Amino acid sequence: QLPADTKDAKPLLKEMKRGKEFHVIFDCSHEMAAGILKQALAMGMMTEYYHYIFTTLDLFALDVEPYRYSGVNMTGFRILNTENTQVSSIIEKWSMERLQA
Amino acid sequence: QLPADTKDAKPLLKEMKRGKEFHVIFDCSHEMAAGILKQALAMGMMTEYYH
Numbered sequence: 115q116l117p118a119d120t121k122d123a124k125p126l127l128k129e130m131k132r133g134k135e136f137h138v139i140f141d142c143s144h145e146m147a148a149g150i151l152k153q154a155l156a157m158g159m160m161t162e163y164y165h166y167i168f169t170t171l172d173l174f175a176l177d178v179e180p181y182r183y184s185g186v187n188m189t190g191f192r193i194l195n196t197e198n199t200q201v202s203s204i205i206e207k208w209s210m211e212r213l214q215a
Numbered sequence: 216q217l218p219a220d221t222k223d224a225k226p227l228l229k230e231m232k233r234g235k236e237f238h239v240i241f242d243c244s245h246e247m248a249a250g251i252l253k254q255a256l257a258m259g260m261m262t263e264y265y266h
């Protein structure tokens with residue numbers, strides 16, 4: 115269980131490092147998933163060894179640019195059918211309609 | 216050698232990962248030192264294995 119006081123998984127992540135649990139399922143929200151990923155990066159928990167799965171259905175929203183070259187074989191799940199052209203067009207319509215982000 | 220005309224050592228670090236070189240002795244000004252360390256962190260080449 116991630117600490118409920120704040121999204122600072124420093125002790126829990128260090129415990130995983132001590133336990134050497136490589137394959138690590140998650141069950142989070144993409145907002146908290148981003149923080150967990152960033153804190154994992156600061157511990158070197160994001161290399162060619164670890165292998166995650168995010169139950170979050172918003173994995174594609176993650177800014178994976180700082181992690182794309184890391185070599186982690188991350189996984190996830192996407193239900194938003196963004197591959198379709200109509201869905202994609204509605205996506206840009208949403209992006210332009212959202213004046214404040 | 217860190218490529219000249221730029222500071223993006225990305226291919227060098229990737230080759231190091233292919234080369235499995237776990238020990239490194241950099242030699243550069245502190246600005247280039249910070250740059251190369253950040254780029255190494257990008258590839259995740261910065262864990263307790265390396266030195």
Ligand SMILES: *[C@@H]1O[C@H](CO)[C@@H](O)[C@H](O)[C@H]1NC(C)=O
Pocket residue numbers: 161162163164165185186187
């Ligand atoms: C790539 O993913 C496989 C599982 O499909 C995993 O066993 C392997 O360690 C991964 N390679 C990495 C993370 O470099």
